[PDB]
């Protein structure tokens, strides 16, 4: 059970990394803003700095506080 | 070899040709700038892609762009 869990978890994570990498490959290779102008994709690309900044904020906040209590304990 | 392209944003400080130690870039007369000069790359097959012209480029964004790919015996910088 332990080997099965760990194997499929690592497989799932590698497949996650591949999914995001191939999404980036979509964004650089074949993406026409003129074809989809003003849609959900173009609007997500419109405020991408907000998304990245909020992800950085929540990651920094979780890491800061979690490491704080782990070191404290 | 590598592809070196110069756009119309160049205004001719004739300093991108000094930073390239491979004689890839040359300066031709032009009329789209005050200095009446424009960078050109006649020996673009002798470029390695060291991007020193990009470091020397003062325009934002850069007038000269070097694109990697299709490497050869001269663009790889081997003396062997």
């Amino acid at each position: 059970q332990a080997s099965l869990y760990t194997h499929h978890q690592y497989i799932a994570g590698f497949i996650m990394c591949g999914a995001f990498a191939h999404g980036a490959i979509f964004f650089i290779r074949d993406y026409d803003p003129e074809q989809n102008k003003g849609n959900v994709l173009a609007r997500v690309l419109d405020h991408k700095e907000a998304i990245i900044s909020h992800l950085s904020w929540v990651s920094l906040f979780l890491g800061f506080h979690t490491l704080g209590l782990y070191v404290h304990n | 070899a590598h592809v070196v392209k110069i756009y119309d944003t160049c205004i001719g400080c004739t300093q991108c040709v000094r930073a390239c130690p491979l004689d890839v870039l040359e300066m031709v007369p032009w009329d789209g700038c005050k200095a009446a000069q424009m960078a050109s790359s006649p020996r673009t097959e002798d470029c390695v892609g060291c991007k020193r012209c990009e470091t020397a480029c003062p325009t934002d964004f850069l007038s000269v762009r070097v694109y990697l790919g299709n490497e050869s015996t001269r663009s790889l910088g081997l003396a062997y």
Binding site: - | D23, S41, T44, Y80
Partner: protein, 143 residues
């Protein structure tokens, strides 16, 4: 320049000791590069692939395995002594090529005698997306 100069086999070479950094088997198989200059006196310079060599009063000859070594030596000479040298390329079959300015007054000048090549009249960033040139063989910057 006004007339394209051909290097002379007779010209001397600077005195130098044995340096491990130098010509390789690529000089035999592939092409190699040759640098020439005319000296006013005997001065000490540093080779781009070796140590220090005392050069000869008059014509001189250097053989470099790479063009980057030749232009490094050219820039060193021009900076240190206002020397203005020129280098060549010698192929495997004996063909001689002239890469240091064919116009003769260096890439820093213009001379109104060379044609603009690989120049885009559009601004950087105005190039089309790779989807518009997909399955065509032409890059967006190559247009």
């Amino acid at each position: 320049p006004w007339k394209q100069p051909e290097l002379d086999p007779d010209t001397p070479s600077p005195i130098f000791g044995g340096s491990t950094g130098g010509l390789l088997r690529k000089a035999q198989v592939e092409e190699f590069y040759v640098t020439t200059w005319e000296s006013p006196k005997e001065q000490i310079f540093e080779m781009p692939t070796g140590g220090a060599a005392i050069m000869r009063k008059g014509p001189n000859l250097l053989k470099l395995a790479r063009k980057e070594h030749c232009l490094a030596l050219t820039t060193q000479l021009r900076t240190k002594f206002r020397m203005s040298p020129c280098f060549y390329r010698v192929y495997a079959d004996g063909k001689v090529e002239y890469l240091h300015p064919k116009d003769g007054v260096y890439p820093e000048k213009v001379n109104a005698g060379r044609v603009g090549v690989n120049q885009n009249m559009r601004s950087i960033g105005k190039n089309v997306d790779p989807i518009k040139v997909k399955f065509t063989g032409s890059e967006p910057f190559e247009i």
